Structure 1
Amino acid sequence: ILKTAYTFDDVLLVPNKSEVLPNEVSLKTQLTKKIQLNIPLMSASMDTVTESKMAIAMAREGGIGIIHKNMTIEDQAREVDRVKRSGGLLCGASIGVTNDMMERVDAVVKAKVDVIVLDTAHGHSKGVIEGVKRIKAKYPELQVIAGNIATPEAVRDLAEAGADCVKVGIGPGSICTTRIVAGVGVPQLTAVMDCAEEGKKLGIPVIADGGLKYSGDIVKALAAGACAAMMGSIFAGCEEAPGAIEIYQGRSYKVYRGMGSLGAMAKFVPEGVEGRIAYKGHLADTIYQLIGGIKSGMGYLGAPTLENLYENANFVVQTSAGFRESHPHDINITKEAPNYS
């Protein structure tokens, strides 16, 4: 019980000397050794976040969407295929460890998915290791993301098993109760930091999944070493996300729930809650704001590229009081900001 772990709100990045203006920087990243994204953002594989429409709009902005799997195998293959024939867009698919597994994989592969994500509550498990070894045995050159994990031991075991990228985050998500009902989890920033570090010794990239709420948070995840950030609530309020529209006190809300929530899984022991976030309009506007945030951050840090950002970033722990100084304070805000609230 000696060691303290930090999440995003716990730290700040120290500005560096910069010869670089924000609209000079390049957010290109390697999602895997083979898959290059233009911007390091991906939409979560949840039934209230990503289907083909969201996945098409992520691809076009430079990112990628991971079509969720809470649908028939044939419907997912249709969603993926819908993305592929909308141009030449990259598309991912979610796969669980099931008796369905390889039929789901065969359908999205033939439908030309670019990357599958074997994601489960506990990526550091015998099922996932065997599942990655099974998939890569059948499809060697296909790209496999394995998650979710929180330790460097977990990185190696999935790298050994053949994953091309690992996905970090047990407990941080906005709709997640894993840490509350199971007691298990690692604060996300320290999780990404430790996993990024072992991932770089091995040649395997890591994704920061969950818990990001502002663009500043993504800068921290990338500075920690993640190759890409994945978000649910940040995208689930967008027009392209599936989700009934609910009305309350003059505002429109989009339904957003955990995949491990009662309503998603339908004696259940859930690991998620169901709720709603405010409608935010079109993805493109949300992406602009996030990219602009990341660019300014790299400007403050003098980083022309994501690699230089990771190599030159210096972190500083702020207290509860610093956290209050960091947010707007002692202001009665009256005009909406596309950046904040």
Structure 2
Amino acid sequence: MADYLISGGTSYVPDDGLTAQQLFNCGDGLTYNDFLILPGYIDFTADQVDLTSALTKKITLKTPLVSSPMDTVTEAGMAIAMALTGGIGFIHHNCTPEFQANEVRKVKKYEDYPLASKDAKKQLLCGAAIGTHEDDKYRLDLLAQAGVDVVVLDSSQGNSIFQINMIKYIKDKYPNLQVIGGNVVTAAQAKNLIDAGVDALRVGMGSGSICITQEVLACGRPQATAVYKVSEYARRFGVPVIADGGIQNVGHIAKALALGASTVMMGSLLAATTEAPGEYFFSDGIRLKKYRGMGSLDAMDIKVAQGVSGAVQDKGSIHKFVPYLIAGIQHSCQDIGAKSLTQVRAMMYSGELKFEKRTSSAQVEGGVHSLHSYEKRLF
């Protein structure tokens, strides 16, 4: 009958809101806080949401969470905790190659965690970072001998001849080793690195909490727009994206995933956790832990500093914080009417998922307001 024959029985949907393509075609240079995702239809419970994510072409994780390769964020303990909770961690390289290899070995030889990320031998997955310099090759070798599963080329500007040469060298010498390229914020850089043969991209420049690259070199891009554009280009070749930098809350993670990113990497949000490197200290009755950019003078100690050093308040253990992030992501997916992150991205690329801009007054309204005092308890 006509009820089905007119358009296939699918009840029409009133057109309200903007698609991601429309939102990011205005050239406004948007970030996470500049927009919201409109709600959809709910016919499932939050606990049924699947957060399985692809870190690289061949590596798949049960959660989209990744720890940044920073000397104040990720060491063997942080990597072990992230792998157990369903994510992965990248060991920093501001150390001797032997120390990094030893940390990787500690991660690999570690012995309920149903979501634990493991390799074919039931060993916890581990990542590591290397540079684009000649010495890094030796470092890579040691990391290869320690059983590292994936390596990320660490650089503020990854579209360089040095990085392409290193990618080709790695692929020739270690064909089975997954390689992540970055950082990039434009489609041209992504094209160059994908042609080089990378298995994933790391997207972000200037958005880091401890980053001052934008005001020093005038180079960067708003995080949300960069994520959207790079993910849209990379999806044409089946290359996943890691949104790196600018993450402050679960909402940012959900927005990054909805815009095309397959994984999200956080430095500050995981900083000051128990598993993070360093020891807690006290200042004015507040418990804090050090957190610094790898380009800050302290980290590298004419030198042009690209980062700052400071402190972050204690957040507890990873084993309690990560489940909260997982629950928040699941609830966001339920609110937008998606049973999986893959479905979220499919809806966004198909135009089903709708977005809306936020004015400054809209941002004020969205946050806490009109209260004499209040306390915020996330969980």
Q: Give the TM-score band, short-chain normalised.
A: over 0.9
Match of 1:27 in 2: 51
Match of 2:168 in 1: 133
State the SS of the aligned residue for 1:83.
Answer: helix
Task: In structure 2, give the amino acid aligned to 1:158.
Answer: L
State the SS of the aligned residue for 1:90.
Answer: coil
Sequence identity of aligned pairs in percent?
A: 44
| Whole-angstrom CA distance in 2 between matches of 1:124 and 1:33 | 20
Q: Deviations over 1:22-76 (max 9, x none)?
A: 1110100111121111100000000000000000000000000000001100110
User: What TM-score comes out, normalization by structure 2 length?
Assistant: 0.87
Match of 1:204 in 2: 239
Quote the offset at 1:331 in angstroms. Answer: 2.4
Q: Deviations over 1:268-296 (max 9, x none)?
A: 21000000010111012211221111111
Q: How much is the aligned-residue C-alpha RMSD, in angstroms?
A: 1.2
Match of 2:137 in 1: 102
Whether the 8 Å CA contact 1:156–1:202 is kept in 2: the answer is: no
Q: How many residues align?
A: 338
Whether the 8 Å CA contact 1:50–1:242 is kept in 2: the answer is: yes
Quote the offset at 1:327 in angstroms. Answer: 1.3
- 2:355 corresponds, among 315, 318, 322, to 315
- 1:321–1:136 CA distance, 2 compared to 1 (3 A): same
State the SS of the aligned residue for 2:176.
Answer: coil
State the SS of the aligned residue for 1:100.
Answer: helix
- 2:214 corresponds, among 166, 179, 182, to 179
1:163 aligns with 2:198: yes
Structure with greater Cα Rg: 2
State the SS of the aligned residue for 2:36.
Answer: strand
Match of 1:9 in 2: 33
Moved more, 164-173 or 313-322: 313-322
State the SS of the aligned residue for 2:270.
Answer: helix
State the SS of the aligned residue for 1:12.
Answer: strand
Q: Deviations over 1:119-157 (max 9, x none)?
A: 101011111111111111111111000110000111111
Moved more, 305-314 or 46-55: 305-314
- 1:66 corresponds, among 90, 97, 100, to 90
| Whole-angstrom CA distance in 2 between matches of 1:81 and 1:338 | 36
| Whole-angstrom CA distance in 2 between matches of 1:260 and 1:161 | 26
Quote the offset at 1:302 in angstroms. Answer: 1.2
Q: Deviations over 1:191-228 (max 9, x none)?
A: 00000000101111111001000001000000001010
Whether the 8 Å CA contact 2:187–2:230 is kept in 1: the answer is: yes
Whether the 8 Å CA contact 1:243–1:256 is kept in 2: the answer is: no
Q: Deviations over 1:306-326 (max 9, x none)?
A: 111112232211011111111
| Whole-angstrom CA distance in 1 between matches of 2:373 and 2:263 | 32
| Whole-angstrom CA distance in 2 between matches of 1:336 and 1:324 | 16
| Whole-angstrom CA distance in 2 between matches of 1:289 and 1:110 | 35
Task: In structure 2, give the amino acid aligned to 1:44.
Answer: S
1:330 aligns with 2:370: yes
- 1:270 corresponds, among 301, 305, 318, to 305
User: What TM-score comes out, normalization by structure 1 length?
Assistant: 0.97
